[PDB]
Amino acid sequence: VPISFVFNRFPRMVRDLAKKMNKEVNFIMRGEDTELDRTFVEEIGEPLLHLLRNAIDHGIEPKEERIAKGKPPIGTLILSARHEGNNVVIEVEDDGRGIDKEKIIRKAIEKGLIDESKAATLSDQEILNFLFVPGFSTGVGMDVVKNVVESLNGSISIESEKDKGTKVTIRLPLT
Amino acid sequence: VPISFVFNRFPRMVRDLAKKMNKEVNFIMRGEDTELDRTFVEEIGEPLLHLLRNAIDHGIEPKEERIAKGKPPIGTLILSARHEGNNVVIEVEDDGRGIDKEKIIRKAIEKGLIDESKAATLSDQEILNFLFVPGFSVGMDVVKNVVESLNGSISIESEKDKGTKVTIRLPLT
Numbered sequence A: 001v002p003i004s005f006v007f008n009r010f011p012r013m014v015r016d017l018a019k020k021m022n023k024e025v026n027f028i029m030r031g032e033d034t035e036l037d038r039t040f041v042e043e044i045g046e047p048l049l050h051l052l053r054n055a056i057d058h059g060i061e062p063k064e065e066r067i068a069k070g071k072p073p074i075g076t077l078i079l080s081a082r083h084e085g086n087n088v089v090i091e092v093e094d095d096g097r098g099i100d101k102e103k104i105i106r107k108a109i110e111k112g113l114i115d116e117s118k119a120a121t122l123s124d125q126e127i128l129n130f131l132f133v134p135g136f137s138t139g140v141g142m143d144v145v146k147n148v149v150e151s152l153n154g155s156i157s158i159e160s161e162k163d164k165g166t167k168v169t170i171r172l173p174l175t
Numbered sequence B: 001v002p003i004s005f006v007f008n009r010f011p012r013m014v015r016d017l018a019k020k021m022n023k024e025v026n027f028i029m030r031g032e033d034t035e036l037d038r039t040f041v042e043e044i045g046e047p048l049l050h051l052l053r054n055a056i057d058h059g060i061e062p063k064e065e066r067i068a069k070g071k072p073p074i075g076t077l078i079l080s081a082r083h084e085g086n087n088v089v090i091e092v093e094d095d096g097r098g099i100d101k102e103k104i105i106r107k108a109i110e111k112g113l114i115d116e117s118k119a120a121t122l123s124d125q126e127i128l129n130f131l132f133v134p135g136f137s138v139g140m141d142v143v144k145n146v147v148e149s150l151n152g153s154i155s156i157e158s159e160k161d162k163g164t165k166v167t168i169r170l171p172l173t
């Protein structure tokens, strides 16, 4: 199917979540005509909704806070799909507050998953990969998202920078 | 301790290996004045030796093969050290044949570490990380074990026909 069968539900959900969280959001969808196997289309909606909720709740800052930090007042959330080879790549990008990598490390230390000595040389991808540890952040856990994607033989990655925003990328096979 | 205590022994070794294996290698060292804990300088020499050997043996192609592929007949091998905040980053880069990621996936399926259905979407880093699994191909597992013993991290980047970069991050300590 076109992925629009899933993506067409999102403007309403984003607008309802934005209203609930009293938060202003500029929501853009691109690549909605990207086609993929019906199995994927039936299963990818749930993980994507979790990602979009997380971006609206934890990422995008209130307008007053963005203005105070010198950002464009209204936060932007971009959901896109495209073909890459025989795979389909779906991205959810926000220009919010980003993920605090220092906080991740502190939490990882507190949970006994690493010591201070080793945290000093971790890469960015290594740090962000703690988010996929079951119960790490415990509120949509990145573990739960990843478990669905993996059930579709897909892969997920996260990139993020404090004050800049977050991009989550999902790659799915043709199957 | 400056890392030159280690780096200064490598040019002769590289040139000896390259001649042995019939390769023309331009070996470049950068950042040899970079200072870190004497402990690190002592222990990192053996792992670095192995990386440099790997690059000359498996990475840089014989001149005849370089010419046949339309590459410069002289291969380049770069060993560098630099400060990055309170870490030190050491890199070993070659312009050789690159690592075959397809071969890695094939071997991993063969050895039963992963099943075919997952391979279509695996990340680059996830694929290259198989090289650290013991017995997968003095080994890369042992280089990783030494680095990790020093509270460091190691990563591999590669592109077929273009070359390979191995990066080691250590604390200053």
Ligand SMILES: c1ncc2nc[nH]c2n1
Binding pocket: A051, A054, A055, A058, A059, A060, A094, A096, A097, A098, A099, A165, A166
């Ligand atoms: C925290 N901060 C920002 C985010 N954008 C998506 N997920 C996030 N989690």
Ligand SMILES: c1ncc2nc[nH]c2n1
Binding pocket: B054, B055, B056, B058, B059, B060, B094, B096, B097, B098, B099, B164
């Ligand atoms: C295989 N091919 C190229 C290489 N360069 C360093 N190590 C390597 N292993």
